[PDB]
Structures are given as structure tokens and as C-alpha cells.
């Protein structure tokens, strides 16, 4: 089953890259939200 997992690991690799970038985009969004007078972050 590993050798078959190789066939789809490319889908999984691009998915993982997209997830990393989306989490960086979320982190910058949260950073900007910090300076918006929201008491949740406290």
C-alpha cells in the first residue's frame, strides 16, 4: 500500500504546502487583529 501511497503523495504534498501558507496568512491576520481593541486576546 506504500507504493500506491506514492501515487497520491503529490496531492498530499501540495495540500500540505497550501495549509502551511493558509496558516501563515491566518497568523498575519491575527497579528493585525491584535491592534484592534479586542479583549479576547487578553
Amino acid at each position: 500500500t506504500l507504493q500506491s501511497s506514492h501515487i497520491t503523495e503529490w496531492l498530499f504534498t501540495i495540500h500540505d504546502d497550501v495549509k502551511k501558507r493558509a496558516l501563515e496568512c491566518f497568523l498575519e491576520t491575527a497579528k493585525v487583529a491584535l491592534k484592534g481593541r479586542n479583549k479576547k486576546f487578553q
Partner: protein, 45 residues
């Protein structure tokens, strides 16, 4: 007397054997492509 006998005729065409031949050829060609690429069936899964 054949009009009260002789059974019922069939328009039969042997297209199943042709289909089997084509399927076998497809299996052979996919196998040969796998071999030349150096990627066996057992090595895909």
C-alpha cells in the same frame, strides 16, 4: 417439410471474442509499457 421443422434461426455475431481479444491486447500493452518504464505492477502498490 422444413416449414414445420428446422428450429428457429439466430442472427449471432461473435463480437465477444473480438472484445476479449482487444481487452487482452490492452493488458499486454499496459504490461509492456510498465516493463519498459522500469515500473512493475508490484512496484506501483
Amino acid at each position: 417439410g422444413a416449414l414445420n421443422n428446422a428450429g428457429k434461426g439466430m442472427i449471432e455475431t461473435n463480437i465477444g471474442n473480438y472484445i476479449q481479444q482487444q481487452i487482452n491486447l490492452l493488458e499486454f500493452i499496459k504490461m509492456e509499457m510498465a516493463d519498459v518504464a522500469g515500473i512493475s505492477k508490484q512496484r506501483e502498490g
